[PDB]
Amino acid sequence: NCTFEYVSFKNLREFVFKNIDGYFKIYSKHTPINLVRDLPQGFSALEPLVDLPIGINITRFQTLLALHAAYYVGYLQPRTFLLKYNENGTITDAVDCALDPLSETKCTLKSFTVEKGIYQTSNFRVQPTESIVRFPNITNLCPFGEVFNATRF
Amino acid sequence: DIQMTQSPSSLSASVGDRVTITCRASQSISSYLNWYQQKPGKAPKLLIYAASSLQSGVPSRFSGSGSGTDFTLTISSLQPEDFATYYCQQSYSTLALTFGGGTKVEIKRTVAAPSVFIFPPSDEQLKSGTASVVCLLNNFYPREAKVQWKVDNALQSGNSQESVTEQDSKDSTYSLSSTLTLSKADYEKHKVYACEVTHQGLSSPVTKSFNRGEC
Amino acid sequence: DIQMTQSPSSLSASVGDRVTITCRASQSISSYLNWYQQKPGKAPKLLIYAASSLQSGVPSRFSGSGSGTDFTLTISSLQPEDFATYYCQQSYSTLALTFGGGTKVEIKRTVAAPSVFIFPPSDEQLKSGTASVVCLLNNFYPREAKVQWKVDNALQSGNSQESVTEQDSKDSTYSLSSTLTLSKADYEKHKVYACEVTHQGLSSPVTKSFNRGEC
Amino acid sequence: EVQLVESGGGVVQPGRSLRLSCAASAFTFSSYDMHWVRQAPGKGLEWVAVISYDGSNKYYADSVKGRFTISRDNSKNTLYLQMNSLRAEDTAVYYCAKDGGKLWVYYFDYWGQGTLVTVSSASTKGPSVFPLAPSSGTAALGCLVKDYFPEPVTVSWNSGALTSGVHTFPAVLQSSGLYSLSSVVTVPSSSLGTQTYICNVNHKPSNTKVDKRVEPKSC
Amino acid sequence: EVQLVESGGGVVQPGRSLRLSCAASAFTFSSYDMHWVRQAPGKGLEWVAVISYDGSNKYYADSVKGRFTISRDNSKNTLYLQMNSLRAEDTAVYYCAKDGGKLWVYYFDYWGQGTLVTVSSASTKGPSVFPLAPSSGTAALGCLVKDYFPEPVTVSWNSGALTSGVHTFPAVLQSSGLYSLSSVVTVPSSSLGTQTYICNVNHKPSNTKVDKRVEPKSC
Amino acid sequence: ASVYAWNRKRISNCVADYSVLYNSASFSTFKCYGVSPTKLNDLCFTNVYADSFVIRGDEVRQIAPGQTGKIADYNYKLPDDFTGCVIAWNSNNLDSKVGGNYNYLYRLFRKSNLKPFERDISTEIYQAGSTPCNGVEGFNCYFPLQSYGFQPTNGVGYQPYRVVVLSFELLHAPATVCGPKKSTNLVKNKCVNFNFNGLTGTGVLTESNKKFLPFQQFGRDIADTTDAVRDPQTLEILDITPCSFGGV
Ligand SMILES: *[C@@H]1O[C@H](CO)[C@@H](O)[C@H](O)[C@H]1NC(C)=O
Ligand SMILES: *[C@@H]1O[C@H](CO)[C@@H](O)[C@H](O)[C@H]1NC(C)=O
Ligand SMILES: *[C@@H]1O[C@H](CO)[C@@H](O)[C@H](O)[C@H]1NC(C)=O
The missing domain is CATH 2.60.40.10 (Immunoglobulins)
Incomplete structure (x- = not known):
């Protein structure tokens, strides 16, 4: 029961898979690196590769290994990023609007340079912790006792 | 299909x-x-x-x-x-x-008893060679009325053809005209021509009959 | 209450x-x-x-x-x-x-006449000791059908039990199976076993009878 | 407000060819598939043909496949139906209908008044008018317009003076290929010798006007 | 969207105890009084028990008062019905229902699928399969699955090949405490010696599978 | 392919050109259920299945919902909610031999009627009698398959007929199959109403010197309003200038 088919260390290969409205978007980016211990530090933008109209509900996944290579996995979240497009339309840097107060100020001012000064960025409201309910403690009680326990009927 | x-x-x-x-x-x-x-x-x-x-x-x-x-x-x-x-x-x-x-x-209306009339072939038609006997059921409801032709007490089927008017605008009753058509030779071969009508408004079948060439 | x-x-x-x-x-x-x-x-x-x-x-x-x-x-x-x-x-x-x-x-449908079948006890059942006579009414409507058992022209009441299926999905007709169950001694004590069926679609009761040990 | 007008219908002999034309108005004729539907005299409706909005697809029922042809001129907003090699079964009223296109399948939204088409191998003939006299509680008399073709024929009593009690039965196509019709009128038995009853029958296709007297049988 | 699932029903001897559990989902279980209502096989509905939303008030009908007990765990969103000293009258399908609380009176808002509880003093028995041969306008044959307990028993013809014309009568609880069932099939009288008819009866509770041949009587 | 092993082909992720069904008038029989062919080339479908096989003319009427017979029951079946089309045309010139073409087989016996879109190719010996057939033929043990008799002189009712059943399935997923889309010539330097891949607007399309990235399809300004686009057919960047307006 198939509903689709398609056919077309030294390398750091990044990929991003995400499902939106039944469309499976795959972005990718291959770069040369010289580091085996951990992810090389630096900024590189990922450009899309595929938009498969599979329309599947995905909640788990797995990898496939060639048996006769470590790999890293991160989870995406709905964040707001300030992206800088250079002249040719390529992303050269990005700022995360929730990483720390400096980045919040950057996103508020829509700039990567913040002039010396004080900037009002956010509001702040303390939420209530617990509820309190108070009603007067009963003083007069309806006399059901003398009706059920009456000495004589 | x-x-x-x-x-x-x-x-x-x-x-x-x-x-x-x-x-x-x-x-x-x-x-x-x-x-x-x-x-x-x-x-x-x-x-x-x-x-x-x-x-x-x-x-x-x-x-x-x-x-x-x-x-x-x-x-x-x-x-x-x-x-x-x-x-x-x-x-x-x-x-x-x-x-x-x-x-x-x-x-929908009340049951109306049909009026049955039997008309022998006209002499002008007999001159041509054909003969048509007309059985007219008038002012009846519902339209379901059985009309049968009898010749010398013998049932006739397929020798005639009926035509029914639409439900009347005044009394909402129907009219039916059965035309038993045949040749002159077959007309003189028999004497009695009768039209029997059976309708929901008739307690029993009503027969209107005539003998050929007696008037 | x-x-x-x-x-x-x-x-x-x-x-x-x-x-x-x-x-x-x-x-x-x-x-x-x-x-x-x-x-x-x-x-x-x-x-x-x-x-x-x-x-x-x-x-x-x-x-x-x-x-x-x-x-x-x-x-x-x-x-x-x-x-x-x-x-x-x-x-x-x-x-x-x-x-x-x-x-x-x-x-709601048209009245269906029941088909009546009478089956005597199987010899295998007689070996055990019991005897069951099966009266089957098939394909009838409505379900109101009287089934009576007669033994030597004597009415039997309470000696059997009926079972009626739901209205059929194909013809919307019913089926009833009356099982007259008794012991072997009570089976040989009598000769004629009959099942009478009275249904709205039957002009008169229909009796299916058999004599014991005659085939 | 959608209008569809049919034209080109008529009487034609078997084996001939005819061309029906439908004119659409008050909607986009070029963006709705058009259907030709025929209704035989006295029978029900019957789908005949279908043409898409762009005039590139044509479909027909088996009864007419390889025999009729459907085309459309979007510039003129017209729909043409060429009916070649017509048989007697083709005798029917033809309508042009819009699709509507609200569903994946074909339904008919609007209909025209249609045009009649008759296929017969009989020439126009003058009607023969005969009397139907009454006898001896009212009485009923009439006239018989037999052996006439084609339809229609207009029947009146006393030049239209006698209206109430008049019943004109629909024509019946007898085995001879012509048409037979009967007109009847019921009058009181008392007024049978004084009042004069004359039935006037006019057949424009044959251009035949006949005034026939009706009198009680004498014997 | 409200779901109620019953569980814990089964077969138990008279005088014993059982615990039925109802699982509520997709609504506030703790804020609605719960009702237990039973329906005996073939009989109508009979109100049984009621428990308040807080599980503090418990009411029973006279038929089961002092014999059954109703409780609820709001933390687990579960409703427990402990039926101690069960009699034969308790054999029924029990349903848990929400109150609704829209009226001052008790009404049932939603019904679960219910759970069957059978009270009998008979052990599981293997069914006895007997033939019902036809005789000499079609014919009808069948099989009799008698003396079996508990329900149900699955009956098929020709290993499920023969489907049309097959009628399986509901089982009847005979006075012996077991169950008697009859299956029949009508076939043309012509195909009585060539076609082989074998009825397959399976009783999973007793784990008894029997294939019984059916052939016309010889006399 | 033989009817019992009716050959299934799949169509998805491609523009479906139905002109082959229109121009070809050699289709002996053609019936659509659920969908009208005229309103078919401007409607998207998730997938299309082309199930093709061979039968004789007398059996062609049997390939449709609510049909019964050898072909309908034991070789190929369709659901009662079928939504597609059925096409059939003669192949006598190709599927006939002077000595009789017997390469087409069909299932003659089967213990049960096939389920919708079920393919059965088993050659199990059919048991027609009480005696079980333990893989051997003989008394009440017949081979389930039989071969057609196709000769040039065979009657029309027995002449070979190739049948193709198209079934259009539209699931709760994006449709990869749509009909061809009509376009027009491109006019520059003139105030026109443009529509690029559903992005509509009004303006003057002019040649530009902006270098898009290979995967980028549109441009935007600070206002987010479309400022440049890329012609889908030819990869050239067009600036969009709103049509001149002002005060008199
Ligand atoms: C996928 O899951 C969502 C909710 O998790 C559900 O609404 C949707 O129906 C699912 N897709 C299909 C095809 O059932
Ligand atoms: C932008 O692209 C041009 C050629 O298209 C190239 O010369 C230039 O170096 C690029 N920008 C940068 C920052 O390299
Ligand atoms: C579209 O047409 C242009 C010519 O205007 C041609 O160069 C190009 O290859 C065509 N695209 C495809 C996918 O064939």
């Missing part, structure tokens, strides 16, 4: 009655049934499509329902302008569109 | 008919009457509450009415999915809740 049976063949109802008509299909059709209305002589007009959709400009009292093989068209309150013929047509088999037999709705 | 008499015990109607079911209470209940529906095998489902309140998600064609002791449930236009058993339940005596007898609605 797909055969659509529409029932009843014809029903009698009064104004304001909740009329219902059924339409059945030989095989299953999802929701591809449509109801059209046609007055006598006038062109058909659309009432319901997809069997659950009221066409724009149609009174709300009409409603279609049903799925699979059986469908129903219901008029909550009958109106004088609703006495017409309704056709149910399927659309599932796109290039084999078929329309239903139809269900004429007549004006 | 409160007894709820629901009528009719069983009614026959066709699709699109305006069905009405009555429910009477021994004493007066103000507006605490409800109607529920139950298909064969399936669990009951709520239709009406307070006798004048349509439950959410129910077709509007169901309507409850009445106050005091007599209440009525009306379906303006019957539908194929509306063939079920309807119960009326009073809620006045909250801690003495009671339900009505029920009114099964069957599919």
